[PDB]
């Protein structure tokens, strides 16, 4: 996260860290949506251009964390993956269209003050909150700058940007399965997700029922926090049918 700030303890209890076993390193962010399901970006698991192709046994899921590198004894819980499910129409060749994946945990994780699931939006939730100008929150342990690494989880609030503006800021083809967020040069304020934040959640707090909903998944960008550029996120509601299908079938 670039130009963000230290998260408060228990501020994002659904935040998950995808951890590579060997070499031990941060692989990506992710989110807890139930006691046995974790949501993340497909490119965190499969991305041929960078020879990335992890299997269940290659990583671990660390939940309830705050500190990036330290083992938070009695606070975080580490889980193994039973099975990975990548969207069958995920487009890694061009624009990361449908950049989404699910991971089923071998054992359910116990909730606590630091571990708690985030809600997934329904059609009305998405319609009412996914509006240009409305701000969401992105969290992660990724790079503090484009070109370093935070001590603790970082957080940044960013406004959703009008589709024409998102479209006009890049040569890449944008689909309805993605939306962009971030401040404009004239707005003065800064902030963006960055390498290592991928798979993390873009959340919004419903003013109607006061619950946090994950509207997006950190997906891609061109550089980080560059003027005139915006971060792109997987549109979670647009792909909820797939999410429900996988969970209904294998869980």
């Amino acid at each position: 996260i670039v130009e963000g700030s230290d998260a408060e303890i228990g501020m994002s209890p659904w935040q998950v860290m995808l951890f590579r076993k060997s070499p031990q390193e941060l692989l990506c962010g992710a989110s807890l949506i139930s006691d046995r399901w974790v949501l993340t970006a497909a490119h965190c698991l499969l991305y041929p251009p960078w020879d990335k192709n992890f299997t269940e046994n290659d990583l671990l899921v660390r939940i309830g964390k705050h500190s990036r590198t330290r083992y938070e004894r009695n606070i975080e819980k580490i889980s193994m993956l039973e099975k990975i499910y990548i969207h069958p129409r995920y487009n890694w060749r061009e624009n990361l269209d449908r950049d989404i994946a699910l991971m089923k945990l071998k054992k359910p994780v116990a909730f606590s003050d630091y571990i708690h699931p985030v809600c997934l939006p329904d059609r009305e939730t998405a319609a009412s909150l996914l509006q240009a100008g409305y701000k969401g929150r992105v969290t992660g342990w990724g790079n503090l700058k484009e070109t370093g690494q935070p001590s603790v989880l970082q957080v940044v609030n960013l406004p959703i940007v009008e589709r024409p503006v998102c479209k006009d800021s890049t040569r890449i083809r944008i689909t309805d399965n993605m939306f962009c967020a971030g401040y404009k040069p004239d707005e003065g304020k800064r902030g963006d997700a960055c390498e290592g934040d991928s798979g993390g959640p873009f959340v919004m707090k419903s003013p109607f029922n006061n619950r946090w909903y994950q509207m997006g998944i950190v997906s891609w960008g061109e550089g980080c926090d560059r003027d005139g550029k915006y971060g792109f996120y997987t549109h979670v509601f647009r792909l909820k049918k797939w999410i429900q299908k996988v969970i209904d079938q294998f869980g």
């Binding site: 408060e8 303890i9 228990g10 501020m11 209890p13 949506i33 139930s34 909730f111 606590s112 003050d113 630091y114 708690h116 699931p117 985030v118 809600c119 997934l120 009412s128 909150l129 509006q131 100008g133 409305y134 701000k135 969401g136 929150r137 957080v155 609030n157 406004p159 919004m204 707090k205 419903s206 003013p207 006061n210 619950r211 946090w212 909903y213």
Partner: peptide
């Protein structure tokens, strides 16, 4: 779940984090 999205250290205790108001203030409609 029916308890999803409600944080033990915030919503459950009726405590607000330092910047959630910024989000609320942006939800004008």
């Amino acid at each position: 779940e029916a308890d999803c999205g409600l944080r033990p250290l915030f919503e459950k205790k009726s405590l607000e984090d330092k910047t959630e108001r910024e989000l609320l203030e942006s939800y004008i409609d």
